[PDB]
Amino acid sequence: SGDHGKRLFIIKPSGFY
Amino acid sequence: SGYTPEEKLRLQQLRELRRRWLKDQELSPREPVLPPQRVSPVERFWNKFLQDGALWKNVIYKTYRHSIFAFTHVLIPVWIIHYYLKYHVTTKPYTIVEKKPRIFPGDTILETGEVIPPMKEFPDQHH
Amino acid sequence: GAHLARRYLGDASVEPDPLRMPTFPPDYGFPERKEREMVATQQEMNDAQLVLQQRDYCAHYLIRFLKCKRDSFPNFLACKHERHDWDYCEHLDYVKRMKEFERERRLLQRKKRREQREAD
Amino acid sequence: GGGAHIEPRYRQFPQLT
Amino acid sequence: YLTHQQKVLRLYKRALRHLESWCIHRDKYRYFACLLRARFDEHKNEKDMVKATQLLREAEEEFWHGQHPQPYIFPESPGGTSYERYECYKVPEWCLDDWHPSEKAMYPDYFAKREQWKKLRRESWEREVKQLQEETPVGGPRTEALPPARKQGDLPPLWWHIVTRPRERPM
Amino acid sequence: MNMFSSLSLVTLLLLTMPIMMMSFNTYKPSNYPLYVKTAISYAFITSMIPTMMFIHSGQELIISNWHWLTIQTLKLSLSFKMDYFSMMFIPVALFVTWSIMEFSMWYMYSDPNINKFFKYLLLFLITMLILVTANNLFQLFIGWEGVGIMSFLLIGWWYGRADANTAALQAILYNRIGDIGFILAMAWFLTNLNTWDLQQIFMLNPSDSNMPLIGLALAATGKSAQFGLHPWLPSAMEGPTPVSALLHSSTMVVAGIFLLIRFYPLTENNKYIQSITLCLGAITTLFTAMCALTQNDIKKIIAFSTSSQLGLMMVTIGINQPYLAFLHICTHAFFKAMLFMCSGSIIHSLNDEQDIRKMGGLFKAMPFTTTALIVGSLALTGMPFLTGFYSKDLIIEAANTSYTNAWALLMTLIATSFTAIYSTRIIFFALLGQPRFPTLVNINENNPLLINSIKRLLIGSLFAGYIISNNIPPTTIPQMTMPYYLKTTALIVTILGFILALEISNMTKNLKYHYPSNAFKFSTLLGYFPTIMHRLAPYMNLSMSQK
Amino acid sequence: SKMELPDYKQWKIEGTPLETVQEKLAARGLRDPWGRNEAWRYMGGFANNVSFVGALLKGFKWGFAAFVVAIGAEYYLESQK
Amino acid sequence: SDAPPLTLEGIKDRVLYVLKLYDKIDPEKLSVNSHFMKDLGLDSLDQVEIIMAMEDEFGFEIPDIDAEKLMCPQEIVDYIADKKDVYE
Amino acid sequence: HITKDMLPGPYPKTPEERAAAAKKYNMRVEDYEPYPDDGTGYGDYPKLPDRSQQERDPWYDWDHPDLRLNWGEPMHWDLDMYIRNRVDTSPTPVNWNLMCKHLFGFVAFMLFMFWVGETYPAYQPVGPKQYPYNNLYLERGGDPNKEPEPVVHYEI
Amino acid sequence: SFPKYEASRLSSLPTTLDPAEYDISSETRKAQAERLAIRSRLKREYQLQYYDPSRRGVIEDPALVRWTYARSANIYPNFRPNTKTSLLGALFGIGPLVFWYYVFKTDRDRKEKLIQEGKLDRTFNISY
Amino acid sequence: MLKYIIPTIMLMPLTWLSKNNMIWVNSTAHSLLISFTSLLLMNQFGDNSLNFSLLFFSDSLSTPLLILTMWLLPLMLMASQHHLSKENLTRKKLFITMLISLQLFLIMTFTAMELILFYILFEATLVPTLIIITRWGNQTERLNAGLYFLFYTLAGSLPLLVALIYIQNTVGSLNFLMLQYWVQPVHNSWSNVFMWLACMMAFMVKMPLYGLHLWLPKAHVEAPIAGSMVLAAVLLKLGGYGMLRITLILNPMTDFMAYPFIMLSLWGMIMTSSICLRQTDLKSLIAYSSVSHMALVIVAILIQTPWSYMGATALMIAHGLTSSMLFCLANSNYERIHSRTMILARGLQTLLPLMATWWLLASLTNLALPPTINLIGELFVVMSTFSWSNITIILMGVNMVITALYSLYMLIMTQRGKYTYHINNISPSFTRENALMSLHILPLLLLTLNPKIILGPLY
Ligand SMILES: C[C@H](CCC(=O)O)[C@H]1CC[C@H]2[C@@H]3[C@H](O)C[C@@H]4C[C@H](O)CC[C@]4(C)[C@H]3C[C@H](O)[C@]12C
Ligand SMILES: *C(=O)CCCCCCCCCCCCC
């Protein structure tokens, strides 16, 4: 958004199920 | 004093462990690898058709996205509501009761050609 | 409240009680009182669809205000003048309300002097 | 986010437009 | 515990903040701040332990009726505007295991290194047990302080979650 | 007729269509946030077509469009009451919601659950509109709870924050308490009377309606945050600002007064309700401002600043002004909600800072924010011809020129000036003085979307309140005649608040030490009602439960 | 990105009330240890700021100038019927 | 709020520039790793004032226990870098 | 799979029995003492301070900073009611009795003053808003069969 | 002046006014150290499981179980003829019940006669 | 009524003759299937009930409870198989068989045309429960709570047997249809006062009644999830059934004998609600919560008003659907942390998104959110008390408040909070777990669309 890239990984609950 | 040599040396490890560790949170160019997914051509139509923009040719797209709402989300329900209203509601007693329309001087009624007697002449104040 | 102050802080009897007002005979020395007419009879008020509180003597003017208003649609700045006819007519009633009170106020104050000498 | 069209300052009047 | 000497500071910094909110204006704040620090420097040279011990009772009995009606508090600190506002979004790391395969297929590279991160979470664990048994007093460890790793390639025991603890802003 | 009724019901069902698209399908992600807003945008238009017809025809339509249930001699339906209030209160709520709609599409960009965020924002709107349009207590009851529940989640959006969990239940605790009178009212109209349809209730004109109305009095005590059940309303400011902007500033808080207005024919004759309601606002309308004179929280202050306006509305009903009080509802909502959004602009550029004492130097460093801050305040303080003044001058007419309690008029003006007092204390720190925010400058509001949000909600207060006055038809005998000072007492005491606060504000510049004062803390600490009643009462109920 | 940080002697107390504390501090026999710390709250482009009177009168010059024209235009548009 | 990024290199002067306005220090003698008590000839009471400035500078409170030990600018950077999890 | 002896039991009436209980919950013998022996029957549990969780420092890195409870620590018999969510007993800003009595003043002050104003309210010195037609007897639905008392409010 | 706050169940005293903590002698030094080491050992004992990869489950806290165990106090303590609490405690659980016995009963007895004489309004009452 | 009894029986060979791995499926498939035919029982008539034969019959009141029971057997199986997967093959058939019989007795119970036959089945219904609770119990603490069930027989069943017998000798029959026409005015006497206690104390304990509830909190603390569901969803509802029917013959004596019962609930409701806020267990909190709702029913039945009966019917229905779901919802956590403590695990919305959706969903209707049937009945009853007595609104209002206070607390304590750091086995929600909750919440709302099916017989 404001800056190109600068993408940080997200830890999430496993949403598949 | 300060972080004792063991603490400061420890912190060097702990902090750098975190500094190096936090670097893992970016992503490779291929990642996040998402599958191909299908595309609807009319969306493809705008994808190539919107690679230019232009004055007259940009509001047209935004206008088009505003054309869907007019009939899909508004006109259809009122047909559904009114249709249901027309036969499945109005056909019942006292399901809809509307206050009798107001009455004013100098008014005529369509039904019986009725007449509203004009009020008495006012005392003629300054006006 | 001068009227509020003078009543109780002053003698209470002189001031007529606002809730019981009026409290003295209408013809307490007040002869030949012309009647207050009603331009719009029971029928017109009924068909006017007006709140009873909105209905009074001056309301016969009030009918004129909206009659233009309904046809005034969509604009709203077309019936301004007609409003003052009712409002000013309403304005007169408020003064009358003030004048109506005093005839009750005067009698209580006047009657005090008459009775004061009747037993002094 | 058009490429940081506003560059924040430090102890300064804002870089307005 | 903590001694009264350090207890002096706990009122030095805190008293300012209530004074700070009272001061509001910047020129007032520094000037009034100088007034307070000047009072501190009235007794800052006082080296009498009985008096220095006795020169703190009134200060605490003095500050209570000067404390702010609505004292200021920093956002991220406890009681602040952003007090744990984002804890609802922070996600535990250990839940990585239950990720569905297809979900994991999006980030093949990142998970590859984790296996080594956990690798030293397992192999180093055994020696980490002994690493405390030379710095382990009888009668239960005296304090909760921890040592570093006195070799190369290992890490100070009891480190896994803090190093892997999520970041401040999940989004 | 057909067109008028048919097009009217579209709004309630139209607004619900996006909701039906959240539980089903996965056709288009990433576009729902705009989807909802356009629906309100479209809904507003369909909310203005009834506006034209209603004013011209004044067609109050009660539509019974179902036969849900039937007990012995009862019948419940999913009916609606298309009348003055719905036709005139719906357009404002959508207008405010439309402004807030685009406001939230920017502020909450930091929330991955933004789509969930709108899954509930649109829900509350639905319930509120159903509430006002409800023709029966039951259906009306449903909205009375939907606002109660939809607030619960929206209040506690960040479920981690202990303030949210405690505050959210605090309001729910109070909100439920109000319903006790509500359920009582249904019982009385079911025992003495026999139905929950307003047609029978008003026509029968109960001769002894103290008990049913007493329940109505309680209903507004907690739901509208009147004194005695007030504290929760400020508590909502522990969460999202946009959430507070609509629920607790314009839409939910109006519930308490609304019921009394909706039962205007019954409330007139019984003065027992009027006095306590008149006094209830009296104690609250100042207790809010009296507390608010020295509060030091931007969002909470606005809440208190809103509280007094709400506290006075009861007095407006307490003086038997059915349709005049209604105006204060719409008029207040515009700017105050904008003030929430304006407070959002401050918090945005401040990067999560809210202390009123940590703000300043924003006249030119925050040009657009400064622009609309004064209008709401001036309109809030009663600037002539502005949205807030019309009610403020009009409302004070009857109260000061009609039968009223001696003490009731006492706090009526004392707090009236206080209304402007905190505004100056706010615009002072907010706009006057050199900057006092932290060293780094994060100030930036060149965001077109918000400007659209501010644009839409900046206009209404200036002009819409003026426009709203013209079309509405006569329903009362305005008290245009009264002593000049009474007609202008507001025009006299209004300037006092600014100056008197200005007298208080500027003397604090001087480099002179401060001095504690009990009253400085009694008002600052909220009169100790929350600080006390929210410790022992939980302790009483819970500490004594085990035995 | 690079965030060029300006010179650190720009912040100063001369000509601003920050030194007025210093002037009164001579009678107090001390000095502010952070004299140059908070010079920005009156420097950097925050020297002049309209007070309460100015806030309400923000931009009223143009409206005031245009207001007279508008009211007169009624006479212009009404004198000729 | 768009993006308030944080960089160690950018933060470098933010901690040090705080010292650059101190009236009890010679700017040139000061170093990135200089101990305050010995290298800068300062005291804990003087050190308290420096710690406070960081809270007005950056806007986040500091615990009393850990404030004391931050006698090195790098450590102060570590506290700011480590608490916010800034690594680059 | 927990021993019988390491569970709440009778009231210990001698210090020797009290030795286990203090040790049982990891409370030193000095800090430990149970409720008085009575029919209350709260067992050999300790008598912890009547304090809330928010009072405890959060800066410490607890196992459960959410509760500010550390593993192995004892729990107040009603620690569930003293949790951060529930009743808080943190230090108060203003004097207890005065705080309670500060509420008493303003609220007690207003109620009676209304009754004082009720006897002498405020109004304007004007007559009734006169109405025609027998004081709107028929407009109010008055029975047409039984005419009301004649009403004529004369001019003036 | 500065009237010291009256310590109350709902208002804990400020930390820097209790005379106990100003002086920290062996009578306080000894106790303070013992708790930390005892607390440390628990942390150390818990630190193994928390940072041990092997565990896949929920720690069986011994403190929690006893706290839950003590709540379910059924017959083990207490004596039947203990006049201090049995008589008065039993009142809190049987006292107010009788109070309602007359409250509603009186109205219904009161209410019934009115109906028998028509002294109460029911003209438009059906739901009963 | 045979068309539902025999196929219920036929599940027994299916539970036994079936293959090793199809034991669960086969019963599940047909058990769900049978309930479909159960819906046929909604062929009520305005003036007369449905009288099949001399052995069974179902009126308007009976059917909704019948549907719930048949609708509830498959749901009980779904939850069961997780904890039974480790059990050996033969026992699972044993446990499953008891449920089939348990349903058999229940369906025959509510449809019984003769009171004694109802009395017989009433006693039988307990036997499967005791095995299920005891044989597969969750505890080994030997509470020695037999006295309560001994007290039940002494103060409950056994007196009821004599009164039922006495009525038949005097009146001449115990067929409810006959009772409708041969009911006689029970004048006031010490004997009748004793007879009255015989007809009601038996059903009061099972509801249960405040003071007599000591078994319920300890019954759920040990009963497995399979046993718990039927207990609160069906078994508690037996008393109201008989009480509604039996009270046909106790007038006018009930006009004054009800007060000690009414006061027990009117005040009992608040007491239970408050203690829940203090409870330290997900199941136990539900236990007293169960007593709360059941207390409202007791008042409705005794006053015997046309609205009371209508509201009472839904309260049993909604509560049965409510609590049953809550146990399953609560037992979802048990499948991970293997505990009943409510504070051991927190902030589960961070790890079980869709699980919290049920939690919020179920809790909403627990506190009688409108227009759901949880509130239609509860709100129906509140009005009826007003005609009986206006003061009652105070206690109902307080009860609703506290019932609204703890209901959200349990949700707040667990889902709205910070995750337990040490817990490391919060696996994603399984299809079975989510499916089980969904079958509960959905129909619970659907009946709100059409209230005419659980309005009771007075409608
Ligand atoms: C039928 C149509 C699918 C069109 C497609 O193939 O993408 C459906 C699926 C996605 C929907 C759209 C998306 O929800 C968002 C579109 C853009 C704006 O939000 C207005 C509604 C909006 C115009 C919607 C109209 C209609 O409901 C859509 C267009
Ligand atoms: C009370 O409500 C108003 C207080 C002022 C009373 C006015 C007294 C002085 C003027 C009285 C004579 C003129 C009539 C207003």
DSSP string, J21-39: HHS--HHHHHHHHHHHHHH
Pairwise CB contact (< 8 Å): C74 & F52: yes
Q: Is C98 in the pocket of ligand 2 (CB under 6 A)?
A: no
Whether the bond between C22 and the residue before it is cis, its omega within 30 degrees of 0, is yes
Contacts of C34 (CB under 8 A, 6+ apart): I154, I155
Nearest ligand by distance to the CA of F413 = 2
Contacts of F288 (CB under 8 A, 6+ apart): F227, F230, F304, F307, F308, F310, F311, F415
Give me the amino acid identity at J111.
K
Gap between the Cα atoms of B31 and A8, Å rounded: 12
Q: Does F473 touch chain C (CB under 8 A)?
A: yes
- Given a contact cutoff of 8 angstroms between Cβ atoms, the answer to whether K343 and K336 are in contact is no
Gap between the Cα atoms of K404 and K421, Å rounded: 30
Gap between the Cα atoms of K214 and F318, Å rounded: 51
- Given a contact cutoff of 8 angstroms between Cβ atoms, the answer to whether K310 and K380 are in contact is yes
Tell me the Cα Rg of chain G.
24
- Given a contact cutoff of 8 angstroms between Cβ atoms, the answer to whether F266 and F202 are in contact is yes
* 3-state per-residue secondary structure call for chain E: CCHHHHHHHHHHHHHHHHHHHHHCCHHHHHHHHHHHHHHHHHHCCCCCHHHHHHCCHHHHHHHHHHCCCCCCCCCCCCCCCCCCCCCCCCCCCHHHHHCCHHHHCCCHHHHHHHHHHHHHHHHHHHHHHHHCCCCCCCCCCCCCCCCCCCCCCCCCCCCHHHHHCCCCCCC
Whether the bond between K252 and the residue before it is cis, its omega within 30 degrees of 0, is yes
Give me the amino acid identity at E135.
E
Give me the amino acid identity at F62.
I
Q: Which chain I positions have a beta carbon within 8 Å of C57's beta carbon?
A: 130-132
Nearest to K130 by CA among K161, K152, K162, K158: K152
Query: Which method was it determined by?
Result: cryo-EM
Residue H7: Cβ-neighbour burial (10 angstroms; 0-12, 13-18, 19+): middle
Gap between the Cα atoms of B57 and B64, Å rounded: 11
Q: Is residue F166 helix, strand or coil?
A: helix
Q: Is residue I54 helix, strand or coil?
A: coil
Q: With the CA atoms of E8, E11, E16 and E19 taken in that order, what torsion angle do they form, in degrees rounded to the nearest 10?
A: -130
Considering only CB atoms, E75 lies closest to which of F110, F112, F353, namely: F353
Gap between the Cα atoms of K297 and K300, Å rounded: 5
CA distances to I40, J89, J92, J95 from J85, rounded to whole Å, are 7, 5, 10, 14
What burial letters (b/e) apply to B58-97, b meaning 16+ CB within 10 Å?
Answer: eeeeeeeeeeebeeebbeebbeebbeebeeebeeeeebbe
Q: Is A touching B (3+ C-beta pairs, cut-off 8 A)?
A: yes
Question: Phi/psi class of residue G15: alpha, beta or left (left: φ > 0; alpha: ψ in -120 to 50)?
Answer: left
What burial letters (b/e) apply to J28-53, b meaning 16+ CB within 10 Å?
Answer: eeeeeeeebbbbbbbbbebbeebbee
Gap between the Cα atoms of H51 and I59, Å rounded: 17
Gap between the Cα atoms of F475 and F115, Å rounded: 44
Task: Name the residue with tokens 């449920």.
Answer: K99
| Inter-chain contacts counted by CB atoms under 8 A, chains I and K | 16
Phi, psi of H72 (to 5 degrees): -115, 140
Question: Residue I145 is encoded by which pair of tokens?
Answer: 């069969």
Gap between the Cα atoms of E163 and K141, Å rounded: 43
Task: Name the residue with tokens 């002494």.
Answer: K154
Q: Does H2 touch chain A (CB under 8 A)?
A: yes
Q: What is the DSSP string of K268-296?
A: HHHHHHHHHHH---HHHHHHHHHHHHHHH
Gap between the Cα atoms of F310 and E134, Å rounded: 69
Q: Does I133 touch chain C (CB under 8 A)?
A: yes
Q: Is residue F404 helix, strand or coil?
A: strand
Residue F71 parent element (H or E): strand F69-71
- Given a contact cutoff of 8 angstroms between Cβ atoms, the answer to whether J73 and I43 are in contact is yes
Question: Residue K228 is encoded by which pair of tokens?
Answer: 């718990």
Gap between the Cα atoms of F157 and F161, Å rounded: 9
CA angle centred on J52, ends J47 and J55, rounded to 5°: 110
From the CB of residue J70, how many other CB atoms can be counted at a distance below 10 Å?
18
Contacts of E139 (CB under 8 A, 6+ apart): J37
Contacts of F541 (CB under 8 A, 6+ apart): K274, K277, K402
Gap between the Cα atoms of J108 and K258, Å rounded: 13
**How many Cα atoms sit within 13 Å of F372 on the Cβ side?**
27
Residue F514: Cβ-neighbour burial (10 angstroms; 0-12, 13-18, 19+): middle
Beta-bridge partners for F197: F136
Q: Does B25 touch chain A (CB under 8 A)?
A: yes
Chains linked to D by 3 or more Cβ pairs within 8 Å = A, F, G, H
Give me the amino acid identity at F203.
M
Whether the bond between B117 and the residue before it is cis, its omega within 30 degrees of 0, is no
CA distances to F102, F149, F458 from F341, rounded to whole Å, are 11, 23, 11
> What angle do the packed helices K190-206 and K158-171 form, to 10 degrees?
130
Beta-bridge partners for F440: D10
Q: Is C9 in the pocket of ligand 2 (CB under 6 A)?
A: no
Q: Is D touching K (3+ C-beta pairs, cut-off 8 A)?
A: no
* 3-state per-residue secondary structure call for F283-347: HHHHHHHHHHCCCCCHHHHHHHHHHHHHHHHHHHHHCCCHHHHHHHHHHHHHHHHHHHHHHHHHH
Gap between the Cα atoms of G72 and F166, Å rounded: 60
Shortest CA gap C68–chain B (Å): 9
Gap between the Cα atoms of H1 and F349, Å rounded: 8
Phi, psi of F349 (to 5 degrees): -60, -25
**How many Cα atoms sit within 13 Å of H19 on the Cβ side?**
26
Shortest CA gap H20–chain F (Å): 15
Task: Name the residue with tokens 């004009």.
Answer: B118
Phi, psi of I146 (to 5 degrees): -105, 105
Gap between the Cα atoms of F537 and K263, Å rounded: 25
Contacts of G32 (CB under 8 A, 6+ apart): E30, E31, E33, E34, G18, G21, G22, G25, H23
Gap between the Cα atoms of J70 and K411, Å rounded: 24
Q: Ligand 2 center to residue F487 CA distance, Å?
A: 14
- Given a contact cutoff of 8 angstroms between Cβ atoms, the answer to whether F226 and F310 are in contact is yes
Gap between the Cα atoms of I144 and I138, Å rounded: 7
**How many Cα atoms sit within 13 Å of K330 on the Cβ side?**
31
User: Is residue H43 flagged as an active site residue?
Assistant: yes
Phi, psi of K56 (to 5 degrees): -145, 155
CA distances to B87, D7, F325, K69 from F223, rounded to whole Å, are 40, 46, 17, 40
The length of chain H, given as a count of residues: 88
Gap between the Cα atoms of F538 and F170, Å rounded: 10
Alpha carbon F327 to chain centroid, angstroms: 12
Gap between the Cα atoms of E91 and H14, Å rounded: 31
Tell me the Cα Rg of chain B.
37
> Sign of the CA dihedral F286, F288, F293, F294?
positive
Strand order in the sheet with F61-63: B96-98, F61-63, F80-82
Chains linked to K by 3 or more Cβ pairs within 8 Å = A, E, F, I, J
Question: Phi/psi class of residue F140: alpha, beta or left (left: φ > 0; alpha: ψ in -120 to 50)?
Answer: alpha
Alpha carbon E56 to chain centroid, angstroms: 26
Beta-bridge partners for F404: I122
Q: Ligand 1 center to residue F21 CA distance, Å?
A: 10
- Given a contact cutoff of 8 angstroms between Cβ atoms, the answer to whether F458 and F376 are in contact is no
Alpha carbon F309 to chain centroid, angstroms: 9
The length of chain K, given as a count of residues: 459
Atom 22 of ligand 1: nearest residue by CA position: F35
What burial letters (b/e) apply to F11-37, b meaning 16+ CB within 10 Å?
Answer: bbebbbbbbeebeeeeeeeeebbebbb
Contacts of F323 (CB under 8 A, 6+ apart): F84, F261, F472, F475, F476
Residue C66 parent element (H or E): helix C59-71
Gap between the Cα atoms of H41 and H83, Å rounded: 28
What is the bridge-based pairing of β-strands F69-71 and F74-76?
antiparallel
> Sign of the CA dihedral H19, H24, H29, H32?
negative
From the CB of residue F386, how many other CB atoms can be counted at a distance below 10 Å?
22
Gap between the Cα atoms of K242 and F234, Å rounded: 51
Question: Searching chain F, which residue's CA lies closest to the CA of residue E18?
Answer: F514
Nearest to E121 by CA among E96, E89, E90: E96
Residue K15: Cβ-neighbour burial (10 angstroms; 0-12, 13-18, 19+): buried
Contacts of E77 (CB under 8 A, 6+ apart): E83, H60, H61
Tell me the Cα Rg of chain E.
25
Gap between the Cα atoms of D16 and D8, Å rounded: 10
